Design a protein around this nucleic acid. Structure first.
Ligand SMILES: [K+]
Ligand SMILES: [K+]
Ligand SMILES: [K+]
Ligand SMILES: [K+]
Ligand SMILES: [K+]
Ligand SMILES: [K+]
Ligand SMILES: [K+]
Ligand SMILES: [Mg+2]
Ligand SMILES: [Mg+2]
Ligand SMILES: [Mg+2]
Ligand SMILES: [Mg+2]
Ligand SMILES: [Mg+2]
Ligand SMILES: [Mg+2]
Ligand SMILES: [Mg+2]
Ligand SMILES: [Mg+2]
Ligand SMILES: [Mg+2]
Ligand SMILES: [Mg+2]
Ligand SMILES: [Mg+2]
Ligand SMILES: [Mg+2]
Ligand SMILES: [Mg+2]
Ligand SMILES: [Mg+2]
Ligand SMILES: [Mg+2]
Ligand SMILES: [Mg+2]
Ligand SMILES: [Mg+2]
Ligand SMILES: [Mg+2]
Ligand SMILES: [Mg+2]
Ligand SMILES: [Mg+2]
Ligand SMILES: [Mg+2]
Ligand SMILES: [Mg+2]
Ligand SMILES: [Mg+2]
Ligand SMILES: [Mg+2]
Ligand SMILES: [Mg+2]
Ligand SMILES: [Mg+2]
Ligand SMILES: [Mg+2]
Ligand SMILES: [Mg+2]
Ligand SMILES: [Mg+2]
Ligand SMILES: [Mg+2]
Ligand SMILES: [Mg+2]
Ligand SMILES: [Mg+2]
Ligand SMILES: [Mg+2]
Ligand SMILES: [Mg+2]
Ligand SMILES: [Mg+2]
Ligand SMILES: [Mg+2]
Ligand SMILES: [Mg+2]
Ligand SMILES: [Mg+2]
Ligand SMILES: [Mg+2]
Ligand SMILES: [Mg+2]
Ligand SMILES: [Mg+2]
Ligand SMILES: [Mg+2]
Ligand SMILES: [Mg+2]
Ligand SMILES: [Mg+2]
Ligand SMILES: [Mg+2]
Lengths: 273, 44, 91
RNA sequence: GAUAUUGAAUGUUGGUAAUUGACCUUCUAACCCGCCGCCCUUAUCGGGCGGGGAGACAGUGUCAGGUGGGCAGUUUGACU
RNA sequence: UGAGUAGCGAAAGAGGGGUGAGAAUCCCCUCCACCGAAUGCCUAAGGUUUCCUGAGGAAGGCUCGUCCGCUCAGGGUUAGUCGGGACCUAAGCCGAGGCCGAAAGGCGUAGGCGAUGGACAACAGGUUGAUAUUCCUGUACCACCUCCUCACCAUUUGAGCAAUGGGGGGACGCAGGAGGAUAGGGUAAGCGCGGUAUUGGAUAUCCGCGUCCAAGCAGUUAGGCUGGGAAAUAGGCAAAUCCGUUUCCCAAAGGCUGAGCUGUGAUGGCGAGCGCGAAGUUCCUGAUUCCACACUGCCAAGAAAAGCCUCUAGCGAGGUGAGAGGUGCCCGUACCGCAAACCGACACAGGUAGGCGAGGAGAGAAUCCUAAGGUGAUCGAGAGAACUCUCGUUAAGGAACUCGGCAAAAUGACCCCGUAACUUCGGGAGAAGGGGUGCUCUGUAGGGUGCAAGCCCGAGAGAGCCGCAGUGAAUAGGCCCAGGCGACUGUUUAGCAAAAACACAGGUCUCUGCGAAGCCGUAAGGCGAAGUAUAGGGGCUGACGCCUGCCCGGUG
RNA sequence: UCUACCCAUGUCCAGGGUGAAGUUAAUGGAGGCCCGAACCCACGCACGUUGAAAAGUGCGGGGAUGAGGU
């Protein structure tokens, strides 16, 4: 549920939060953590290549099992946990052999739920099968693009995709965006919608809360100078004053499609979003 | 008022020192020029 | 190395004279010499029993004779305490 | 877009006397893989080997057209 | 030349004595004054001998100079334990092969380097002109070694050692509150030592000063977390008697840790005071420190690696434990360090991380005056004009001033009463507006601490007293009505603009199916993201509320 | 070595007030919350303008648990 704060100050006015009712423990699994330093949107040259990224809270990386490749061994859901590195919650799985792993927490998973990977697994929320084994109409998440690589698509909080049909070697899947696409049938997908569906409703409330999440301010092009941005300059406020709205680097940025026109995956994409 | 020169021997040596100069072609040209001019001090 | 390369010369000061009453002998030593080498050198040369060697480095002093500035040599000074039951060194 | 890297088949439709074109589909063996396993090897680099995916496409070279204040060099008269 | 002109850089000195060729300026003494959450003490960076002693007075010192951070001599820095290295890793940097690139080179794997972090054994007192967890005294601890001593275990299921491997651990945020404790404080009581005053009074509930103590070792403790045992085991690159998991069996124990306290250390040391040396207890108060990120709460979800422990894999004829004897390197250590020694060209009203930071009254690190301790400021002497500056006061009037109440004045603390429009129901609000506030006696009610005397804290009254005035000084909101703009806290033109500009939460459009788009780079390699459409980039708008019409010809 | 932003790792912030959620009027202790030192800033005025200072000083001023300072 979304908790709404009372307006005890102007900062707090309209601010909302997760109640974190799903989260069953505060402490992560020490063995599945890795270090994760901030980059500030700087690349290997030390240069800022993405704007508006920097600062925010320190975070440890939780190693998530996107592959879901322990076929046959049953796994008990031990915890549902906050992960700072992603919108979804994660679930610690205790496998019967004593291996521990994190997965993405699906909607309506519970502590003590048994889960199973592989072609022989049941079609139940938390399980992970090859798409050849998943029946048509099944809501899935954490979809592989290449066999064995790990789930890449449909991982964010509340997101879901649907298996539409099997074309032998490929399976049709409606992705979360609404795009319909051929996925190799050997690729795995996890059963269910991703949990933490309310995430999108959160009203961040104040500037400082965006800063905690590592988002530095966006300055509009219109209030820069001509040497900085195509929209810069003009005496007083100015309209766009150009044929198209423009990016900082002088490309059209409203409607202009940027997917590469010769793309190898074009054949796999059946219906665009 | 905080002025521009804030001395620090580590930073002096790391930025301007002999090993820094020797670590690049252009730094080696600095040393070659200063030797050619006949400087007492080649580097920090 | 030779023992007599380690010990350069005795320090003859009021301080060093006061130390000799306490059975401590001050030497200028080779700048590279560690205090174990100094201990071994004193025992070899003088035939005494060393309790401990304390050692210190002195920087070169800036100096002038007219216009020409320059530095004195850096020095390594060893204060060699002999044991209670030991022969004294003859300076 | 042409052409090189660039191969093999099956169709179909040109043009010359059975060869050579054009295009469609298929193939695998070049090429590619920011996919998996194994080894070099204590290695999220690289390379090798074996799967898988893709495939004569892509990528890259040469040539060509379009777009292109993103950037560059400049011009923007004189009388008064 | 200007000109013997401007200036001589925030500040309290006065006299006596001394030295000397010479003294406002150097030394000594006395009293006075200044700082005292510092102008004290410690210690970074930085400086590099400026430190100490003796001698000096050309220059430097805004004057002088016998003096000095200056000149000349000579001297001074002592470590197994402090800080750094012979330990560990972060960001980043370097980078065998490697990838990429006209050349130069760029990138990057293994592997390293790299503290601002992790780890890690010594304390108290004394001493020099100048060093001191470094020297000395006393009492310790850590690692390693074996000519030795003693005990115990064992020579192929055979002690023991044990990985560069596995596992555990290390290992982490922010806020809040309550405990426990200790520094520190009060001198309350007791104790000790000294004093009894000549200015009216006082063996007085009189005056002054002092009133302790380490690491280590042994014991103990507020407590803190932790559930443990036994089998079996698709996992932990091999193996595991370890870890993980499961199932049974007990729910108090066991672990792991603990500030501090007590004994000892100490037949010692320190100690008012006069080399000698008294008392050296208790009570009260009490942290911003420690127990301890322990607990509780919260979302923004809070390094790594080693030391350490354990496990096997290995290694093994001698081991293990205790004693005794022994070994323990290099670098720094002077001095300045809110400053005349560093950064500002200066002996410059500026800047300079961190630790400690006492008392009275106090909520306090505010404020004023003081303590410990430090200091009197590097031109002076007069005169007391204009004018300028910084202050204080001002008849009557009270914004008439002025672009504008600019400046100044006023308000100011605590307690009690009372408090509007409007509102997003939080606010507005310390709204506004009133009243009280000292001292004495009753003398407290009550509370904390203690076994109790006692010691702190302490309303609310009643009756009195004094002044022009009682938060009698210093320090402590002026307030209200209405309107434009921007919702808000933030941000900005270092050095003429702080704003209505930027940002912002929210809104919307758009791109982006992941080798994503976008971006940096010739490329390799990267950022995006160890993210995956509830995500990421770009444009515009800018809380919230009500809303956001018409036009697709032109341009995109 | 100034400054802009970022990265890793430390550290600093006297005191007082208000009283969100939650819990059972009390309890609780939220906040780019309030008042206010240190610290950071630089709104007004004066002075300074061959300065004590190539941006300061004095008296007032803003922030002061945060989008914080260092
Ligand atoms: K808000
Ligand atoms: K903006
Ligand atoms: K403009
Ligand atoms: K003060
Ligand atoms: K002198
Ligand atoms: K020293
Ligand atoms: K602005
Ligand atoms: Mg952005
Ligand atoms: Mg502008
Ligand atoms: Mg432009
Ligand atoms: Mg424009
Ligand atoms: Mg206009
Ligand atoms: Mg030493
Ligand atoms: Mg142009
Ligand atoms: Mg030209
Ligand atoms: Mg003309
Ligand atoms: Mg004309
Ligand atoms: Mg005259
Ligand atoms: Mg004149
Ligand atoms: Mg005159
Ligand atoms: Mg004058
Ligand atoms: Mg002066
Ligand atoms: Mg005073
Ligand atoms: Mg001196
Ligand atoms: Mg003079
Ligand atoms: Mg150390
Ligand atoms: Mg490199
Ligand atoms: Mg090489
Ligand atoms: Mg360090
Ligand atoms: Mg230590
Ligand atoms: Mg000293
Ligand atoms: Mg010292
Ligand atoms: Mg100064
Ligand atoms: Mg008090
Ligand atoms: Mg005080
Ligand atoms: Mg008047
Ligand atoms: Mg009057
Ligand atoms: Mg008027
Ligand atoms: Mg007028
Ligand atoms: Mg005013
Ligand atoms: Mg504003
Ligand atoms: Mg300005
Ligand atoms: Mg201004
Ligand atoms: Mg690329
Ligand atoms: Mg990446
Ligand atoms: Mg706008
Ligand atoms: Mg419109
Ligand atoms: Mg049209
Ligand atoms: Mg605030
Ligand atoms: Mg400061
Ligand atoms: Mg500023
Ligand atoms: Mg304030």
């Amino acid at each position: 549920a979304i908790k709404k704060y009372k307006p005890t100050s102007n900062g707090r006015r309209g601010m909302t939060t997760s109640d974190f009712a799903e989260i069953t423990t505060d402490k992560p699994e020490k063995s599945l953590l890795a270090p994760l330093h901030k980059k500030g949107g700087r690349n290997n040259q030390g240069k800022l290549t993405v704007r508006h990224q920097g600062g925010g809270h320190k975070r440890q990386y939780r190693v998530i099992d996107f592959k879901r490749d322990k076929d046959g061994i049953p796994g008990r859901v031990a915890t549902v946990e906050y992960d700072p590195n992603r919108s979804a919650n994660i679930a610690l799985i205790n496998y019967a052999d004593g291996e521990k792993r994190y997965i993405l927490a699906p909607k309506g998973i519970q502590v003590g739920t048994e889960i199973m990977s592989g072609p022989e697994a049941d079609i139940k929320v938390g399980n992970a099968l090859p798409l050849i084994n998943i029946p048509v109409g099944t809501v899935v998440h954490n979809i592989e693009l290449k066999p064995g690589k790990g789930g890449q698509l449909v991982r964010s909080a509340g997101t879901s995709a649907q298996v539409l049909g099997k074309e032998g070697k490929y399976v049709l899947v409606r992705l979360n965006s609404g795009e319909v696409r051929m996925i190799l049938s050997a690729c795995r997908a996890s059963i269910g919608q991703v949990g933490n569906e309310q995430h999108e409703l959160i009203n961040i409330g104040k500037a400082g809360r965006s800063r905690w999440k590592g988002i530095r301010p966006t300055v509009r092009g219109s209030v820069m100078n001509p040497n900085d941005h195509p929209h810069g300059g003009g005496e007083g406020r100015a309209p766009i004053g150009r044929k198209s709205p423009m990016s900082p680097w002088g490309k059209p940025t409203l409607g202009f499609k940027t997917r590469k026109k010769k793309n190898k995956s074009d054949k796999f994409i059946v219906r665009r979003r | 008022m905080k002025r521009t020169f804030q001395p620090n021997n580590r930073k002096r040596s790391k930025v301007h020192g002999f090993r820094s100069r020797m670590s690049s072609k252009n730094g080696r040209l600095v040393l070659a020029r200063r030797r050619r001019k006949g400087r007492k001090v080649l580097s920090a | 190395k030779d023992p007599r390369d380690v010990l350069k010369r005795p320090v003859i000061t009021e301080r060093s004279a006061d130390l000799m009453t306490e059975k401590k002998y001050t030497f200028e030593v080779d700048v590279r010499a560690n205090k174990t080498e100094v201990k071994d050198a004193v025992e070899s040369i003088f035939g005494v029993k060393v309790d401990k060697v304390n050692i210190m480095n002195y920087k070169g002093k800036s100096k002038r004779v007219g216009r020409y500035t320059g530095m004195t040599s850096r020095r390594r000074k060893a204060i060699v305490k002999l044991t209670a039951d030991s022969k004294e060194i003859e300076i």
